[PDB]
Design a protein around this ligand. Structure first.
Ligand SMILES: [Fe+2]
Length: 80
């Protein structure tokens, strides 16, 4: 797609909404694609947190949102 992150974000949000309907426990962290305004992926991708815990972050190729091999994953800005 020309805006792969934007498209994925919409789909993930829809899927999350559906999952929450039947979810056996309230999920307070989840991954929403972190998109730039052009519809691609920010180099940094972070888990969304709603529980006062830092989300995991990792680094991705902006054109596909796939984790860069050998790049770090930490609960903080990995400095991608
Ligand atoms: Fe970026």
């Amino acid at each position: 797609w020309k805006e792969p992150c934007r498209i994925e974000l919409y789909r993930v949000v829809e899927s999350l909404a559906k999952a929450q309907e039947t979810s056996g426990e309230e999920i307070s962290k989840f991954y929403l694609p972190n998109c730039n305004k052009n519809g691609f992926y920010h180099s940094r991708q972070c888990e969304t947190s709603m529980d006062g815990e830092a989300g995991l972050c990792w680094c991705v190729y902006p054109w596909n949102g796939k984790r860069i091999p050998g790049s770090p994953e930490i609960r903080g800005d990995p400095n991608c």
